[PDB]
Amino acid sequence: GVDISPKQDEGVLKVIKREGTGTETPMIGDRVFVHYTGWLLDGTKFDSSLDRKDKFSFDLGKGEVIKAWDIAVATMKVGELCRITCKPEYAYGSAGSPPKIPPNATLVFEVELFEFKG
C-alpha cells in the first residue's frame, strides 16, 4: 500500500485495491501476463496497453521494462489490482521515455496482473 524502496529508500511502492486469489507472487526471470495504465506526475495519461489491441507481457527483471516494475511486480499476487508510484532512479531518470518524458519527472502506473507461474 505505500511508497519508498526497502534497500535504496527512494525507488517505488504501491497502493492496494483488490488483493489476489492465488496467494503466490512471480520469481526472478519468470513470464508475467500484465496489463498497465500510466500517468506522469502532472495527471497526464501518456500510456495504456489495452488501447493498442491487447494486454502487456514481460520476463521479470530482464532489461525489457523498468526497475520500478521488477520491484513492485515481484510483490504482486495472481489476479491482484493496485497503483504503482515510481521515482526516476528505478524508471525514466537516467534516460527519458522517447515521445515527451525528461531526465527528472515523477511517474505513475495502475497495474492488473492476470497470472505468471501458471
Experiment type? NMR
Q: 76 and 111 in contact (C-beta within 8 Å)?
A: yes
Cell of 32: 508475467
- Whether residue 101 lies in the annotated active site: no
Tell me whether residue 71 is one of the annotated catalytic residues: no
Residue type (1 letter), 19: E
114 is catalytic: no
**Catalytic residue among 47, 59, 101, 114, which?**
47
Cα–Cα distance measured from residue 35 to residue 1, given in angstroms and rounded to the nearest whole number? 19
- Of 33, 36, 51, 71, which one is the catalytic site residue? 36
Please give the distance of CA 110 from its chain centroid, rounded to a whole number.
7
Distance CA 92, CA 78 (A): 27
Q: How far is CA 63 from CA 51, 53, 60, 81, 89, in A?
A: 24, 24, 9, 24, 15
Single out the catalytic residue among 56, 90, 109, 116: 109
The backbone region for 61, taken as left when phi is positive above 0, alpha when psi lies in -120 to 50, beta otherwise, is left
With CA atoms as reference, report the closest residue to 2 among 77, 103, 75. 75
Domains of the chain: 1-118 (3.10.50.40)
